[PDB]
């Protein structure tokens, strides 16, 4: 019960880098750049309410 800090500071204290931090809360989305254009790993379920 002290002063506030961003709750990722303890994660780094557990030897977690920022990228690992991002890959522990969120679902990644991979994009590909082929044939001089931009593609996307589309997931139909994710497009709910957009």
């Amino acid at each position: 019960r002290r002063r506030k800090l961003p709750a990722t500071i303890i994660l780094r204290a557990l030897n977690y880098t920022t990228e690992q931090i991002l890959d522990l809360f969120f679902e990644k989305v991979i994009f590909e750049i082929r044939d001089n254009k931009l593609q996307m790993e589309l997931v139909p379920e994710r497009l709910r309410g957009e």
């Binding site: 961003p6 990722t8 780094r12 204290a13 880098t17 920022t18």
Partner: protein, 50 residues
């Protein structure tokens, strides 16, 4: 957003930031900054949910 407001960037800066938040006074070191955080949630003589 939490990572966006995080001053620390690695393990040293984190444990040191915790060391400066808990015991605001003496210059944060390596052993002290680490042993403190370990003796908070990772030590039987200092932490126990029973």
């Amino acid at each position: 957003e939490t990572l966006r407001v995080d001053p620390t960037n690695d393990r040293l800066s984190a444990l040191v930031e915790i060391y400066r938040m808990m015991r605001p006074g003496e210059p944060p070191t390596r052993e002290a900054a680490e042993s403190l955080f370990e003796n908070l949630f990772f030590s039987e003589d200092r932490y126990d949910l029973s």
